Amino acid sequence: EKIAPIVKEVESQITEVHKRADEVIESNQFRVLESFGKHKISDSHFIPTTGYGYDDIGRDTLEKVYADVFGAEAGLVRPQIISGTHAISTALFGILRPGDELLYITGKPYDTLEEIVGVRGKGVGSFKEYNIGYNAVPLTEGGLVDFEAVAAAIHSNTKMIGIQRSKGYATRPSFTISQIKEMIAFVKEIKPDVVVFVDNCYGEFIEEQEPCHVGADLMAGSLIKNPGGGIVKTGGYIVGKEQYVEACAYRLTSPGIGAEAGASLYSLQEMYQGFFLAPHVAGQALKGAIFTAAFLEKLGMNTSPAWNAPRTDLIQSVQFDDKDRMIAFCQAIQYASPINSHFTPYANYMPGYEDDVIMAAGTFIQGASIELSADGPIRPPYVAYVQGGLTYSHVKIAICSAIDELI
Amino acid sequence: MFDRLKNGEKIAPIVKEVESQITEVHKRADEVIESNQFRVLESFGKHKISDSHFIPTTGYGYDDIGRDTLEKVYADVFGAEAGLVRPQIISGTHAISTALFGILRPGDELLYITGKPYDTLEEIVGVRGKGVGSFKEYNIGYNAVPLTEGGLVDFEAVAAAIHSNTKMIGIQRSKGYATRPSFTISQIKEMIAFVKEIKPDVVVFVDNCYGEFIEEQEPCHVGADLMAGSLIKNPGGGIVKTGGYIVGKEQYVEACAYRLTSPGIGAEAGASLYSLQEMYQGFFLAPHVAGQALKGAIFTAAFLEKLGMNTSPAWNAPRTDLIQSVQFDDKDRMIAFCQAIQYASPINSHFTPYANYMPGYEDDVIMAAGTFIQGASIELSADGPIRPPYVAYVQGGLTYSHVKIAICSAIDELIE
Amino acid sequence: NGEKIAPIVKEVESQITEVHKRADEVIESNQFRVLESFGKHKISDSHFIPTTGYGYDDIGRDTLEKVYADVFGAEAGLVRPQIISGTHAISTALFGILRPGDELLYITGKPYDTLEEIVGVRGKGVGSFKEYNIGYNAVPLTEGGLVDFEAVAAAIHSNTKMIGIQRSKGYATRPSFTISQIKEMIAFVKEIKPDVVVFVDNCYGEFIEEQEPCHVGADLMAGSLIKNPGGGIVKTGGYIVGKEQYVEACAYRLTSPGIGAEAGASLYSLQEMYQGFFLAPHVAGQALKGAIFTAAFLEKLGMNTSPAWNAPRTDLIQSVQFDDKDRMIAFCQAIQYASPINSHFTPYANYMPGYEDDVIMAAGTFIQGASIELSADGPIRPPYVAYVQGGLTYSHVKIAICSAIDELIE
Amino acid sequence: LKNGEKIAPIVKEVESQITEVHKRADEVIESNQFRVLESFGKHKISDSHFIPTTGYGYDDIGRDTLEKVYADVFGAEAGLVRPQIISGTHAISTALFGILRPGDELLYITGKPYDTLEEIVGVRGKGVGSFKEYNIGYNAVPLTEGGLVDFEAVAAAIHSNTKMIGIQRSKGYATRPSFTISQIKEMIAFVKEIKPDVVVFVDNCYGEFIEEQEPCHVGADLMAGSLIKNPGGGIVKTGGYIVGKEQYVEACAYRLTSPGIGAEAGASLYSLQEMYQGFFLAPHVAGQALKGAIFTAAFLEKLGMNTSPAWNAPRTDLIQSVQFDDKDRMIAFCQAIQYASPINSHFTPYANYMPGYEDDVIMAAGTFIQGASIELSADGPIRPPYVAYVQGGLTYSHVKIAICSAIDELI
């Protein structure tokens, strides 16, 4: 038929960068395998703990595994930690004390941080009530970091510097590890004291290093994203320097507990095995992302990133230029998704945002954005984020089905 | 029962005499077990709980009807408006932290009036360790107001110690290892109404561990603004593998919840996974499972008394929690006993306990604990400081049989 | 009501005092026995460890299977989540021993409907004795509920591989059979035909006497786990215990020839089965001390009940005579609403597949069909006898039936 | 890797050689996965099908429907895919027995089946509930020396009593190629002609989703497998499936649970989501392992040793083998494999006695699920010419990395 011959062409087009992703996967897989080897993980580690959850070799060892791979000295990846926003809250509060300041050097971070930093809700337990400053240095009009403004913002009370890797809904390239390495070296030059924290959601195992490999003191994410293999039903993670993880430990739970208690329950296997599959599962979403870009190019739509552009995370978006074209697409996806095909997506009023958005996401786990989900704010020139993919076959079948429907 | 074991034939006649003695208090414990059991049933009716409530959620944990509702059921029975009982709170000591921090801000003072709080509040209030995210580094004040020499609340000292900075008042219900009576709801209704007068602002917080479903009313019934505990304890029915509840006034709970999770997130997230049945069900059985452990304290109280040891509380004494101790007066007798209790349990009976050095305490201690869960102290257990006159805390029990059988087995094994 | 009711229940209890301590005696003696056996196999929380895939070498399971054995007076023990129901155990147990050319001889009379299907006297022989060339005969009881030892001993010819004996009464108007009653039974047939394998469907019977069928000479015995032994705490399963070469014969019907008892992933269900077993005596005790009350509080209210409160117990069955349709129905309704879960899910007269009469069924239960919990049910027909049996705690059973009597008066 | 500058250009050449075979395994990946998606779309599956059921396992719309999806996608009317079946071996004996009655005969036409089926017929089992005690006969038409089915022998060995035809897709240790959906089509067609009365059953293990069809798409009456293998995605922790015609599965249902009950009962507990998501993932997971075999063949052959099937050989299943031709090499490599596995890598294995085998076998299984052969496992008996099985793998990489490491690890 009509569609076949062009997807025949796009795949023949992107072979170069596709073959390449397979590499960083192999690499990423290899490293993972060596940590498992080095830590001699046995099914003995899949053993559940109850009550207080003291003496959980599985938990303690999974934490030292992640931390190994993520390039860090210490790891705190437990089911307790409910998500990746909870993690960053933890990381943030775990380190900030009255009279301090967090300095975000990437500009306004994703919405939810607003609320943590008490600039949204009137302080529900925020920095605002713990007298903890917060500053969001904007980006160059060109999308780089305002190193001038950053240098000027830093001072004695700047306890902590923030960096968000993936762009999200923000209008700028998702920051590379290399761009992140330059970053910490800059600020640390001005004040070696500061702890540098990076929010590493969406960026895991899509490059061959994570921010800790290059001088970050803490980072975090969600397991319902990349490092999860699409198998971990919840949780987050915090890996970094032994002493700053300590404080994330006491913060999460309580003084007198730190990171020694909290039962595993039946959660420990799916995390190991998700992490083993992670580099490859993330691989699948990336080779999908890039095909999405290569495909909607030909069909005649501004895609971003462009397919032949480097990638530091799983963000990808296309401009349909037409409202009715967007919505049909995002519905095509929700119908091509595995679970909940039948719950077709319509325009929803978005709290905060004076526009309506459409949210396509038919995923095995609630909000596991490692799985295929399309969505975007209803407004010109009609950009809908279409990312995720547990298997390349899925992403390929999905957006093939998305063009069938609306073509 | 089955005294057809070993020496236990001189024993048989005495238990047969004891049980006939404590029939009075057993009847009445059975009653509040009814009472309490009944409140639980009618609350379940009001919230129309179904197996639709046992439904697992995953991912972010939004829209968890089973979770939210368990929450408003714990609150309903513990006499509060809002609650927070979920796996996230990983224990009893977590909840109390959460509780305190969830409400305390820089400039404030916590005021404990029930005297020195059990060991591990030290670390929280940051007078033990340090740099551990304690009150120390948050400028949050704290004071343990000591009790009377008679083990009452020094009411004069309490008033003397409450200034406008006092944001939060502390009340520990269970005596623990403290040489003082476990304060009663009555003692606690007069307690909070006192400070409430001096400072109608103070937020009264009670620590309700071991006390749950052993009077016909909990702290939130009598004015407290916040209480908590562990689920591997009473309200768990010996069935819940872990947790920690917080119950109290809509908005104090709220602030706790944001402390658990994060600002903006609040309480409305965090997946259930598979934990929701054992909790509904631990709760429904609870008032009974504690009932069995409470009658246990009474049987050990009457029995050891006869055999010639100071027990505490005495069998005929009134009861607000499950604590119980016997004065063996001898090191080798105490240890043989605690060991026999470890051997009388269902799991690990064979890991026999010995004296091990207690960090912080200048004495060794011994610990019996053969529990179906790790550290669930609703189950039979025993320990104590190895120091004259050799008091060992023998408390807990899933079934009255088990307690009975158990401390009998110990006396039999005290044939040496 | 409520102040007209209380003096009566205070006077029910004050009368049932002695029978209550007796029900306790046997709890202590049964709970003490489970302790010893636990004590014996050094069981630990390392016996709860989950197993997946093939479930090869599962110390956790196998040892649980031993325990169940030593406690029921049998050699081996086969008890696993795979056994999805009591019916399955018995199906597994019967088929596992019976071979083409053999006959089963139930002597405790017409077994409950479900065996009607497995043997193929009812259902269209969907894998029934009929299809495997196996005969089945039940000897009808005496007019007074005893066993017809004459019709028994004349029906045991050379083709009688197996004896069948149902302990609990079911909906049958004959008393449940006691551990002594059944000991007489097997001694009888083993004399006539030492070959016969004697089997006992022990459902509802576990931990209500200080012994079980296999303690008095039975070759094999099966039941549900979401009932008595599971302590209300386990979520699925079923047990067959008995002699070495019968259980392992069982093993080959459940899994498959060559697997035996070596395979099967426990997964997540170990701890509940152990702990259930440990609470089981005390829990099965609450439904017994609950039943007798049902019998002595309902008697005092001028309604025939059975067994009598002072009647010696062997299982958990308790029935009460309402004598009026609306009365009976209202009561069971009142039970459903007095239950921990699904109290709003009020039940009525339904049609029931394979019963000339409607049935009313109250089932406020945490576990689907765990007949260890308080349930009220029975066939809506004169003289309107309902079964009010089960109850996870004495209180529950007291509070509910008290509430039942309430909705009757108003 | 230490010795990895002679290997990198070689595996780089293995790949550039197998380029087309891979794309072709992708084709049927896409084609298989689209089909699973379709059938989900059809039963409108939701996160409410994931819901646990305890006790009698009644009113369990999650289980039963999950069966229909399996059936649909496998081209059968009905399915009995539930945890109550503990493995493939059980799926097969539940199904064999679920249909065979006294006086009946089983005629396996693909020659001698894999060991464990012996223990079920009473050929080794000492008659422990085997066909023998129910007066059921069993026979196997031994293949031609050419590896094909001896049709002349088949047609004579079918008499009025032959209730059931047995066909085994995968090869196991049988020195004969695993048969294809096509080879199998001709098979059922023959026998249905000779006796339209026969019920033809296919032990389908290791084949599911490796072709664009399955046995009941080409006229099979009934097929079994294990869930911890292909169809389970590598993600399901226990199970097994029977799929096929209405009145066989239902019959099968009655052998499994009980007469009178059928498929009505059986508590799911906490297992629905993994079986569902295992199924959506399966087509792709099986691909990573098939893309592995192809490779292992095209890499080990270049290194001199016989591989079988050949890398370019058309595929019907996941079984792969490599002739090492020296005992030591065969051991070291299987050890090399074990260590390259995610879990149990320090659990180094050797030649030890094997119950039921005149030889010792060495088994490297660093799997997550105990015996789930969908994960990379190396194993094989120690005897000339020392052919080993280096098969399975959750991801192509794992597979590449591992054997690459094993070559390094010795050569």
Is any Cβ of chain C less than 8 angstroms from the Cβ of A48? Answer: yes
Does residue A371 share a domain with residue A257? Answer: no
B218 Cβ neighbours under 8 A, 6+ residues apart: B78, B79, B185, B208, B211, B212, B227
CATH number at residue A22: 3.90.1150.60
**What is the phi/psi pair of residue B35, to 5°?**
-40, -65
Q: Subunits touching B (CB < 8 Å, at least 3 pairs)?
A: A, C, D
Of C238, C265, C292, the one marking the end of a domain is C265
B187: number of Cβ within 10 Å: 16
Decide if A217 contacts A207 (C-beta within 8 A).
Answer: no
Does residue B15 share a domain with residue B114? Answer: no
CA nearest D119 in C: which residue? C258
Q: How was this structure obtained?
A: X-ray
CA B94 to the chain's CA centroid: 13
Is any Cβ of chain C less than 8 angstroms from the Cβ of A46? Answer: yes
Does residue A170 share a domain with residue A69? Answer: yes
Q: How far is CA D26 from CA A14, A149, D18, D29, in A?
A: 16, 51, 13, 5
Does residue A318 share a domain with residue A220? Answer: no
Does residue D34 share a domain with residue D152? Answer: no
DSSP D117-137: GHHHHTSSS-SSSSGGGGT-E
Does residue B337 share a domain with residue B219? Answer: no
Is any Cβ of chain B less than 8 angstroms from the Cβ of C362? Answer: no
B12 Cβ neighbours under 8 A, 6+ residues apart: B3
As for how many domains chain B has, the answer is: 2
CA nearest C252 in D: which residue? D129
Does residue B405 share a domain with residue B317? Answer: yes
Residues of D in contact with C265 (CB under 8 A): 86, 237-238, 370
Distance from CA of C49 to the nearest CA of A (A): 7
Contact C45 A50 (CB under 8 A): yes
- Integer Cα distance of C28 and A243 in angstroms: 54
Contacts 24+ apart (CB under 8 A), C142-149: C145/C173, C145/C174, C145/C175, C147/C107, C147/C108, C147/C109, C147/C185, C148/C107, C149/C188
Does residue B213 share a domain with residue B147? Answer: yes
Contact A47 C49 (CB under 8 A): yes
User: In which domain, by residue range, is D315 found?
Assistant: 1-53+268-411
Distance from CA of C269 to the nearest CA of A (A): 11
Of D267, D288, D313, the one marking the end of a domain is D267
Substitution target in D46, D48, D51 with the highest count of B β-carbons within 10 Å is D51
Residue D106: its H or E element: strand D105-108
CA nearest A249 in B: which residue? B132
Substitution target in B62, B90, B348 with the highest count of A β-carbons within 10 Å is B90
Among residues 212-271 of chain A, which lie with CB inside 8 Å of chain D? 231, 269
- Integer Cα distance of D81 and D89 in angstroms: 14
Residues of B in contact with A85 (CB under 8 A): 262, 264-265
Of D267, D291, D310, the one marking the end of a domain is D267
Does residue C254 share a domain with residue C129? Answer: yes
Whose structure tokens read 């001699």?
Answer: A40
Q: Which two tokens stand for residue D109?
A: 């036409």
- Integer Cα distance of C386 and A351 in angstroms: 56
A403: number of Cβ within 10 Å: 17
- Integer Cα distance of B13 and B301 in angstroms: 17
- Integer Cα distance of C179 and C174 in angstroms: 16
Residues of C in contact with D54 (CB under 8 A): 226, 235-236, 367-368
Is any Cβ of chain C less than 8 angstroms from the Cβ of D128? Answer: yes
- Integer Cα distance of A185 and B232 in angstroms: 48
Task: Please state whether the peptide bond connecting residue A381 to the residue before it is cis, i.e. omega within 30 degrees of 0.
Answer: yes
DSSP classification of residue C318:
-
Helix D272-300 with D396-409: angle, nearest 10 deg: 40
3-state per-residue secondary structure call for chain A = CCCHHHHHHHHHHHHHHHHHHHHHHHHHHHHHHHHHHHCCCCHHHHCCCCCCCCCCHHHHHHHHHHHHHCCCCEECCCCCCCCHHHHHHHHHHCCCCCCCEEEECCCCCCCCHHHHCCCCCCCCCCHHHCCCEEEECCECCCCCECHHHHHHHCCCCEEEEEEECCCCCCCCCCCCHHHHHHHHHHHHHHCCCCEEEEECCCCCCCCCCCHHHHCCCEEEEECCCHHHCCCCCCCEEEEECHHHHHHHHHHHCCCCCCCCCCCCCCCHHHHHHHHHHHHHHHHHHHHHHHHHHHHHHHHCCCEECCCCCCCCCCCCEEECCCHHHHHHHHHHHHHHCCCCCCCCCCCEECCCCCCEEEEEECCCCCCCCCCCEEEEECCCCCEEEEECCCCHHHHHHHHHHHHHHHC
A293 Cβ neighbours under 8 A, 6+ residues apart: A303, A304, A305, A306, A307, A309, A316, A318
Decide if A241 contacts A218 (C-beta within 8 A).
Answer: yes
Judged by DSSP in three states, D107 sits in: strand
Is any Cβ of chain D less than 8 angstroms from the Cβ of A338? Answer: yes
Distance from CA of B174 to the nearest CA of C (A): 26
Dihedral of CA D398/D399/D404/D409: which sign?
A: positive
Q: Which two tokens stand for residue D36?
A: 């699973």
Judged by DSSP in three states, D203 sits in: strand
Does residue B211 share a domain with residue B74? Answer: yes
Residue D61: its H or E element: helix D61-74
Looking at residue B355, its amino acid is A
Contact B264 A112 (CB under 8 A): yes
Nearest to D47 among A42, A335, A339 (CB): A339
Distance from CA of B255 to the nearest CA of A (A): 7
Q: Subunits touching C (CB < 8 Å, at least 3 pairs)?
A: A, B, D
Task: Please state whether the peptide bond connecting residue B106 to the residue before it is cis, i.e. omega within 30 degrees of 0.
Answer: no
φ/ψ region of D218 (left if φ > 0, alpha if ψ in -120 to 50, else beta) reads alpha
CA nearest B275 in D: which residue? D270
Residues of B in contact with D270 (CB under 8 A): 56, 274
CATH number at residue B161: 3.40.640.10
DSSP D253-322: HHHHT-TTTTTS-----S-HHHHHHHHHHHHHHHHHHHHHHHHHHHHHTTTT--EES-TTS--SSS--EE
Judged by DSSP in three states, C129 sits in: coil
CA nearest B132 in A: which residue? A255
Residues of C in contact with D90 (CB under 8 A): 255-256, 259, 263
Assign 3-state DSSP to chain D and report helix, strand, coil percentages, each to 5.
40, 15, 45
Decide if A3 contacts A407 (C-beta within 8 A).
Answer: yes
Does residue B50 share a domain with residue B78? Answer: no
Does residue B143 share a domain with residue B289? Answer: no
Nearest to A82 among B126, B255, B269 (CB): B269
